[PDB]
């Protein structure tokens, strides 16, 4: 939408949780589990491929 403006990635993930109706404390208080789940999900794609 213009020039790239940097933001830390967990803070971008919190904006995106807001965009679906969940408060952002739910992301910050679960950060490690959410990242573990994303990593297992990405590791399952290359296994199926």
């Amino acid at each position: 939408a213009g020039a790239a403006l940097q933001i830390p990635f967990a803070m971008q993930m919190a904006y995106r949780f807001n965009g679906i109706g969940v408060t952002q404390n739910v992301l910050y208080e679960n950060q490690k589990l959410i990242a573990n789940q994303f990593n297992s999900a990405i590791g399952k794609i290359q296994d199926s491929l």
Binding site: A1, G2, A3, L5, Q6, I7, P8, A10, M11, A14, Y15, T23, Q24, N25, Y28, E29, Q31
Partner: protein, 109 residues
């Protein structure tokens, strides 16, 4: 709100014009400009409680902390009407110490 469906930027409004066998759309959009960098933090710890912005981000100009809206820089001081509380400050990665100002009790002298 569909990205790039009505031009580049944040769609404000669009005007139609007729062409021969066709149509022309003049899209008016909003494009952000002249950014500055800041230090930032996800929450703020005060009295053993974690505070999150209601809307906006916590930013630091070098020595002081403010809340701003995310798309236009307009800094304000962090109060209990700017933020909400959830939990204690032991669980959030990158939490920062600052004071969150209450209006009522300095009204009550």
């Amino acid at each position: 709100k569909r990205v790039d469906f009505c031009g580049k930027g944040y769609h404000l409004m669009s005007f139609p014009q007729s062409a021969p066998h066709g149509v022309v759309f003049l899209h008016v959009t909003y494009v952000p400009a002249q950014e500055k960098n800041f230090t930032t933090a996800p929450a703020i710890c005060h009295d053993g409680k974690a505070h999150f912005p209601r809307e906006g981000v916590f930013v630091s100009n070098g020595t002081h902390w403010f809340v701003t809206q995310r798309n236009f820089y307009e800094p304000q001081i962090i109060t209990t009407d700017n933020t909400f509380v959830s939990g204690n400050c032991d669980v959030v990665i990158g939490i920062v110490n600052n004071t969150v100002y209450d209006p009522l009790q300095p009204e009550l002298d």
